Amino acid sequence: ATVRDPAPQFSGKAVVDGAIKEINSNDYKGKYIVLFFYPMVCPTEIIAFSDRYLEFEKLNTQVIAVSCDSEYSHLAWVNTPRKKGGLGEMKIPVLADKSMEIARDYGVLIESAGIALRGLFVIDKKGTLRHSTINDLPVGRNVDEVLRVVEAFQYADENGDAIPCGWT
Amino acid sequence: ATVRDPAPQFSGKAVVDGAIKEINSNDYKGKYIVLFFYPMDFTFVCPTEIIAFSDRYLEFEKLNTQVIAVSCDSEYSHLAWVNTPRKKGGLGEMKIPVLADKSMEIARDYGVLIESAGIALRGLFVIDKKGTLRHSTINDLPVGRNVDEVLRVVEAFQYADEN
């Protein structure tokens, strides 16, 4: 499964607004989705997205972090001050994937180490894969770049799937 | 084939320094490799992307990395492409090699071939000094790639490889 393919549907229990909720990808139809995997290291990446969450909302997109761990420990993580390495008050959902079935479905699972690569995926309003960044574990991701990709794909979908030669 | 894997071998005839030369992936060991695919046959493709990469080549060379473009056509067409002024639609002087991929075996080897459009997705791949895959950006055709981001990724990987 790769780009221009209908993106693999995902569901499960996440921590949202400090609470555990069953969420499904089909719940986010009509909005873009940035699905990104945090391999269970520095939490500042996921925290960064959480801080820029409003900018993502301007573009009608939903960021969802995904990690190879339980919803209860994810709650434990949110119920920890950032000063101790925990997540503190999160503004984007943190989805549990102890089974790692989502990581496999997205091909960022290392079927030898039992860990996920830093995968990031942009899904459009019709539920199709538009972008896939995948990094080896040591290198983090950049929010400004993700926002750039999202706004570009949006302008494309609006202006007939074609971007002017030299955009902003 | 995914990240942390020894990268798929690529070889072929490229346009290097305004001339057709045989290049191999094994030729670039000891250096990073940015392998990126520029779809020509995309009816709305813009050369400003690959031109950009051509311009920032010095910045890539400071970091001991070799950017190689790969495009869906022969070394003769790539030469013809280089030998066409930009104000006439061509590439003009390119500062990175343009590798030929008419058979799209290189595109298939990297999993970027759209086996219906006969075109490759805008795939970008960072390869380390022992030749294993460290990064892969893949975009849908309408969205181009950013040189600054690539530079960030490469130097980040280098600092990691040292520390």
Side-chain angles (χ1 to χ4, degrees), chain B residues 11 18 22 34 45 55 69 105 125-126 135 139-140 148 159 162:
Chain B
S11 61
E22 168 75 21
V34 174
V45 76
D55 293 340
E105 68 170 335
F125 303 86
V126 180
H135 169 90
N139 292 342
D140 200 346
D148 282 317
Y159 198 81
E162 294 172 346

Side-chain angles (χ1 to χ4, degrees), chain B residues 2 14 16 18 31 40 51 65 81 90 97 99 101 110 112 144 148-149:
Chain B
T2 180
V16 182
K31 270 195 148 53
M40 286 173 305
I51 284 165
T65 83
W81 195 12
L99 188 63
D101 196 28
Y110 276 79
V112 295
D148 282 317
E149 182 67 1

